[PDB]
Ligand binder design. Structure first.
Ligand SMILES: CC/C=C\C/C=C\C/C=C\C/C=C\CCCCC(=O)OC[C@H](CO[C@@H]1O[C@H](CO[C@H]2O[C@H](CO)[C@H](O)[C@H](O)[C@H]2O)[C@H](O)[C@H](O)[C@H]1O)OC(=O)CCCC/C=C\C/C=C\C/C=C\C/C=C\CC
Ligand SMILES: CC/C=C\C/C=C\C/C=C\C/C=C\CCCCC(=O)OC[C@H](CO[C@@H]1O[C@H](CO[C@H]2O[C@H](CO)[C@H](O)[C@H](O)[C@H]2O)[C@H](O)[C@H](O)[C@H]1O)OC(=O)CCCC/C=C\C/C=C\C/C=C\C/C=C\CC
Ligand code: CLA
Ligand code: CLA
Ligand SMILES: CC(=O)O[C@H]1CC(C)(C)C(=C=C/C(C)=C/C=C/C=C/C=C(C)/C=C2C=C(/C=C/[C@@]34O[C@]3(C)C[C@@H](O)CC4(C)C)C(=O)O/2)[C@](C)(O)C1
Ligand SMILES: CC(=O)O[C@H]1CC(C)(C)C(=C=C/C(C)=C/C=C/C=C/C=C(C)/C=C2C=C(/C=C/[C@@]34O[C@]3(C)C[C@@H](O)CC4(C)C)C(=O)O/2)[C@](C)(O)C1
Ligand SMILES: CC(=O)O[C@H]1CC(C)(C)C(=C=C/C(C)=C/C=C/C=C/C=C(C)/C=C2C=C(/C=C/[C@@]34O[C@]3(C)C[C@@H](O)CC4(C)C)C(=O)O/2)[C@](C)(O)C1
Ligand SMILES: CC(=O)O[C@H]1CC(C)(C)C(=C=C/C(C)=C/C=C/C=C/C=C(C)/C=C2C=C(/C=C/[C@@]34O[C@]3(C)C[C@@H](O)CC4(C)C)C(=O)O/2)[C@](C)(O)C1
Ligand SMILES: CC(=O)O[C@H]1CC(C)(C)C(=C=C/C(C)=C/C=C/C=C/C=C(C)/C=C2C=C(/C=C/[C@@]34O[C@]3(C)C[C@@H](O)CC4(C)C)C(=O)O/2)[C@](C)(O)C1
Ligand SMILES: CC(=O)O[C@H]1CC(C)(C)C(=C=C/C(C)=C/C=C/C=C/C=C(C)/C=C2C=C(/C=C/[C@@]34O[C@]3(C)C[C@@H](O)CC4(C)C)C(=O)O/2)[C@](C)(O)C1
Ligand SMILES: CC(=O)O[C@H]1CC(C)(C)C(=C=C/C(C)=C/C=C/C=C/C=C(C)/C=C2C=C(/C=C/[C@@]34O[C@]3(C)C[C@@H](O)CC4(C)C)C(=O)O/2)[C@](C)(O)C1
Ligand SMILES: CC(=O)O[C@H]1CC(C)(C)C(=C=C/C(C)=C/C=C/C=C/C=C(C)/C=C2C=C(/C=C/[C@@]34O[C@]3(C)C[C@@H](O)CC4(C)C)C(=O)O/2)[C@](C)(O)C1
Ligand SMILES: [Cl-]
Ligand SMILES: [K+]
Ligand SMILES: [K+]
Lengths: 149, 149
């Protein structure tokens, strides 16, 4: 469908970024700029969003990540093909959850002002142009998701 | 049902342990005794198990956690009523996933030999009596879950 088509485009444009991330780093376990109770507010919104998702879409998303784990290289990076299946599944998951519950997650993360520190720190460890191209691609992808909603 | 009743008992018996854990600690973000790709391999088993759960059971589990998040005290401990609903929902989730996929998660974590370091460390920060009461209650609870499969 159109989400599937958009997933192909998103995946191919954002794969360079995905390959550059250090998947072995322990940094992702903690958000140092927030206390745990602040992080839990965003976790709450993601739990609410997930509970709003179609079971069929969630199960497809789970299977796609299971396969993706199976195809990782020595650096932890799954294949483009399995990345595309992940993005297609997540697109269908987000579609089923609806806009308000998805925006509630953004809004909860906005309370961390990640653009000041975490965002630029993460970008500094990858190719900036590749990160920008992934974001441009995400902005197009989200339009197909919203069209489905 | 039988899982509901077993959850009421398990929750009351394990609430002392639950209250004693330091929910504000960052220690849970990392497992120091395994590489991240070894942890990912155990996460694979949990993804598979979650994909096997009935969709409505999983949904009920998420709604129970959302409610629990709204009742946490200053130390992060949810109310016993909400903990009980969590355990009843998780019990139905596990029952729907089945025994083999649940044991596959156990066996993955058994690879980490947690009883040699992590288990003792976690138990040292709480009351060992209450941790053991929680574990014995868990062994009774799992009998009702298995009986439902
Ligand atoms: C499985 C789910 C797990 C976690 C969910 C996490 C993240 C996804 C959820 C939400 C999105 C995240 C943040 C958005 C919120 C606020 C905006 C912001 O921040 O904005 C900052 C920045 C983006 O900046 C934006 O950047 C763009 C740049 O694009 C512009 O400029 C471009 C040029 O580059 C182009 O011209 C383009 O056309 C134009 O629009 C604009 O300037 C926007 O105005 C500006 O806001 O985002 C950033 O920093 C991105 C930082 C993301 C870091 C990742 C994770 C955070 C840490 C922990 C997660 C928490 C818990 C763990 C989970 C579970 C526990 C076990
Ligand atoms: C949402 C899900 C998230 C994470 C999943 C985590 C946990 C759930 C999954 C599996 C269960 C975990 C471990 C079990 C595996 C092997 C057994 C073991 O290890 O055994 C050791 C010990 C218990 O030992 C057992 O203890 C009992 C004690 O029983 C005796 O003593 C009792 C006294 O209470 C009774 O009298 C009883 O009758 C008597 O037999 C026996 O001695 C057994 O022989 C002995 O094996 O357990 C321990 O230490 C257990 C330590 C638990 C530590 C917690 C987490 C693990 C670490 C990281 C999480 C990873 C990733 C997070 C995910 C995502 C990131 C975003
Ligand atoms: C198996 C392990 C595993 C791992 C390591 C991850 C890791 C991640 N997941 Mg996935 N997830 C998994 C399993 C996993 N997930 C499973 C089993 C499910 C259920 C089926 C999901 C469902 C899920 C959802 C629904 C979402 C995630 C998202 C994310 C990312 C959140 C942080 C972020 O935005 O970074 C940066 C993101 C990436 C590196 C991913 C690829 C690039 C994207 C598409 C564009 C990035 C644009 C820009 C550069 C950064 C974002 C800024 C902007 C949003 C403000 C992170 C890379 C979230 C995400 O990516 O939000 C954007 C998200 O929405 N995951
Ligand atoms: C909102 C945030 C949040 C937080 C912080 C947690 C945190 C936890 N979850 Mg929950 N989870 C959540 C949301 C959350 N979850 C959501 C939204 C879902 C989906 C609906 C789940 C679904 C889920 C499942 C399916 C399971 C967990 C489990 C766990 C625990 C894993 C580590 C462990 O065993 O510690 C120790 C455990 C506790 C402190 C829990 C209470 C006491 C238990 C019942 C007995 C403990 C016995 C013994 C002392 C220790 C374990 C020994 C082992 C051999 C069994 C941990 C306490 C796992 C777990 O507890 O396995 C044992 C588990 O099986 N969670
Ligand atoms: C049981 C089970 O399996 O659950 C499964 C549940 C899911 C949801 C399916 C699942 C998943 C997805 C998950 C969790 C995604 C998580 C994404 C987290 C991203 C975190 C990021 C980017 C964190 C940081 C931290 C940073 C810190 C930077 C700094 O501190 C540094 C260094 C130095 C300081 O001086 C300055 C600083 C700038 C402050 C940073 O820059 O970024 C998974 C894994 O499958 C597990
Ligand atoms: C039942 C149960 O337990 O379910 C489990 C199910 C899972 C899946 C395993 C699970 C999980 C993970 C989940 C849900 C993750 C969710 C992630 C959500 C990410 C949301 C994002 C990125 C949203 C946005 C919104 C944006 C908006 C941007 C703009 O609008 C802004 C501001 C202004 C406009 O002018 C321009 C704009 C640019 C348009 C944006 O940029 O990004 C969990 C938690 O474990 C629960
Ligand atoms: C440790 C380790 O090795 O881990 C390995 C684990 C794996 C899994 C094997 C692996 C991998 C692959 C990974 C992580 C892929 C991640 C993909 C993430 C995709 C996320 C997507 C698409 C999210 C969204 C959010 C959306 C929101 C859209 C909206 O809100 C927006 C904006 C604005 C609203 O107005 C309308 C809206 C429509 C509501 C959307 O449309 O899409 C890897 C790389 O190998 C690493
Ligand atoms: C108990 C235990 O051990 O659990 C283990 C479990 C695991 C799964 C094995 C595990 C793990 C792995 C995990 C979660 C990995 C998650 C990775 C997430 C990476 C996120 C990245 C890169 C985020 C960003 C955001 C960026 C933003 C860039 C921009 O916004 C910037 C700045 C400015 C804009 O103008 C342009 C822009 C381009 C938009 C960027 O460039 O990058 C871990 C940690 O080992 C713990
Ligand atoms: C996007 C999103 O929201 O995803 C949601 C996805 C879910 C699944 C729904 C979700 C959830 C649940 C999760 C992840 C549960 C995770 C549990 C993790 C438990 C980890 C433990 C016990 C870790 C450790 C580490 C230890 C270290 C011990 C030692 O090093 C110490 C200190 C010092 C030395 O002495 C040596 C040592 C002894 C070795 C230890 O002793 O224990 C959540 C939160 O809702 C988020
Ligand atoms: C589709 C989708 O969205 O899925 C998502 C859904 C979620 C839920 C959000 C999600 C998640 C988290 C998941 C699945 C967590 C799973 C946890 C599993 C825990 C399992 C446990 C404790 C199992 C066991 C087994 C044991 C056995 C013990 C014994 O047998 C032993 C050895 C020997 C006998 O002589 C005695 C015995 C005492 C009998 C034990 O002691 O413990 C994920 C990953 O995000 C995917
Ligand atoms: C950071 C922070 O503040 O977080 C806050 C977040 C919250 C959510 C609000 C909060 C809370 C509450 C929490 C964490 C509750 C956690 C509960 C976990 C319960 C887990 C259960 C029941 C797991 C299982 C596994 C089972 C497996 C059973 C079997 O395998 C067994 C053995 C043997 C096989 O032969 C048969 C089998 C039958 C297959 C089972 O039967 O059950 C708190 C405390 O407030 C903290
Ligand atoms: C990006 C970011 O910031 O994400 C943040 C997201 C969150 C959600 C806010 C977050 C968090 C909170 C999390 C996951 C909390 C998880 C807590 C887990 C606690 C586990 C405990 C206590 C485990 C145990 C196991 C024990 C074992 C005991 C025994 O086996 C022992 C030894 C010996 C046997 O004979 C008897 C026994 C009795 C059986 C014990 O006694 O205790 C965090 C970390 O802030 C990160
Ligand atoms: Cl509400
Ligand atoms: K592709
Ligand atoms: K003690």
């Amino acid at each position: 469908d159109k989400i599937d088509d958009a997933a192909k485009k998103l995946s191919e444009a954002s794969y360079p970024f995905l390959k550059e991330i250090d998947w072995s780093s322990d940094v992702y376990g903690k958000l140092p700029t927030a206390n745990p109770f602040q992080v839990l507010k965003a976790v709450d919104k993601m739990i609410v969003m997930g509970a709003a998702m179609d079971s069929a879409a969630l199960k497809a998303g789970a299977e796609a990540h299971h396969k993706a784990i199976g195809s990782i290289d020595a650096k932890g990076v799954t294949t483009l093909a399995d990345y595309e299946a992940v993005n297609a599944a997540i697109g269908h998951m987000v579609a089923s959850a609806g806009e308000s519950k998805t925006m509630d997650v953004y809004n909860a993360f906005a309370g961390f002002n990640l653009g000041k520190d975490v965002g630029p720190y993460m970008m500094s460890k990858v190719n900036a142009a590749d990160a920008s191209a992934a974001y441009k691609a995400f902005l197009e992808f989200k339009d197909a998701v919203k069209a489905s909603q």
